[PDB]
Design a protein around this ligand. Structure first.
Ligand SMILES: Nc1nc2c(ncn2[C@@H]2O[C@H](COP(=O)(O)O)[C@@H](O)[C@H]2O)c(=O)[nH]1
Ligand SMILES: Nc1nc2c(ncn2[C@@H]2O[C@H](COP(=O)(O)O)[C@@H](O)[C@H]2O)c(=O)[nH]1
Lengths: 144, 148, 141, 148
């Protein structure tokens, strides 16, 4: 099955997570995991009024990890966000990089659920989540 | 507890309901329940290629514990070969009335709460009795202040 | 060359048109032209608080599949757009006393309507929201 | 003058800019300006298939007739082989500072007003100086009371 996520729905979930991150004073910045957490991170930054938004770029070599770009620090007083958590192969690396960081996501599948500190929506392990940035509004033929 | 429904999601449900209503040659037209069934009806008409769309206007003023139903405009026939569609069915008050006017019609809705679930021939999404549904036509994209 | 109209935008135009139809009390009902004017007519009916909504289905074969009764006194005949106006002429005859309005309007059909909201070139194709959907689009790379 | 920008429209504009940036192989990475350039920069990274996305956060502050700038965080290099992006350019003041930080960087934005149009290497939509561009992230879909 394919789970369709629209910009509107994503923004609704992002605001729900943003409320659980109150007060805003308890945070110094947001570390968005490229590229999935870029949009979700931008939404939290706005809702919380956080101007310090850094990123972490990680690539896969095949399974090895290749930290393209790394945000400084140990993650203390920061929020690390990615769009979803499927298994935790990427989250595990993010965890050890920023042990003191508050790792959050929007969607979370059963296998990766225990790796995150907080998430908004539960998605079945066998469901593909189609994010709004991978879609667009185009002509769709009539069924009849 | 509110269930937000955007235009994009409504259209997805409408297209899922249209696929069940195939073929389209078995329908003579569509009767939309004004005003809630107008958009869903317009969507089905497009997907099915049906140009014959009509309406049935029903005014419902609630007085304490009793409803004052009033059919303003009425489509004709027994509903035979037609598709009567509304947006949702809460208690079934409007549904029972419609079913009475068009007994031979295939009554369908996009959403359906438990109370009215047994009163429709087909629907797409299940909704809890205590949950209110915010339709797209009652909403709009506007400025929303930051949480912080 | 195409003109993409998203539901959000179509709704904004419908509201701008609704404010021009104020007061709501000066109307008896709305006659939506099937199928293009169904969604726009539904939006006006929501804003103006009009529960009396009817339809009129013409046909290209001219052919009046179904029609509302009367000359349109106190009613509003609505459609989504007016390209040439060949369909607007037929509506003018069926409902003479009706206030004909549309969302979009091209040069050739502008004089045929009483009011509209957006101006579209004669060469531009208006891709309506009901003919579209949110689907996966491959990366440009 | 209020200019409304929905999520869909922003994505349409972003893809148009992405097509002009081809081939993607000529870029080493994208530097997004917090916070306005974050969403557009994330959209280009998707279309161009670029995983290297960094940022530069500059906090502005106004004191009557003078602006106080503060770099909260900054990317490395002169911006060589990089695409620095922001959502829009109002007076170009913010852009002039970035042009000084990243001289060899390809600076682009989605929208552009007259006062800052010459400061950007490339943009998509032209917006009047007296028009307020309401962005998607600052909006939401909520209940809107009827006109009557
Ligand atoms: N927008 C909206 N209208 C509702 C909802 N529940 C009931 N209604 C209104 O009440 C009618 C259903 O009432 P019923 O006849 O099923 O008791 C609907 O046609 C609709 O006009 C809801 O959750 N959302
Ligand atoms: N949402 C929104 N922000 C604006 C608008 N005009 C200016 N801004 C804010 O001010 C900055 C541009 O200021 P500049 O330095 O170009 O005068 C933008 O990056 C943005 O943060 C507008 O029309 N809409």
């Amino acid at each position: 099955e394919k789970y369709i996520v629209t910009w509107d729905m994503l923004q609704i979930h992002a605001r729900k997570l943003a409320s659980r991150l109150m007060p805003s004073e308890q945070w110094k910045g947001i570390i968005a995991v490229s590229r999935g957490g870029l949009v979700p991170g931008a939404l939290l930054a706005r809702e919380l009024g956080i101007r310090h938004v850094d990123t972490v770029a990680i690539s896969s070599y095949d399974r090895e990890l290749k930290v393209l770009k790394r945000a400084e620090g140990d993650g203390e007083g920061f929020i690390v966000i990615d769009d979803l958590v499927d298994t935790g192969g990427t989250a595990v690396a993010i965890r050890e990089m920023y042990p003191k960081a508050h790792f959050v996501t929007i969607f979370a599948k059963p296998a990766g659920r225990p790796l995150v500190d907080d998430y908004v929506v539960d998605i079945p392990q066998d469901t593909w989540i189609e994010q709004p940035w991978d879609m667009g509004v185009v002509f769709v033929p009539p069924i009849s």
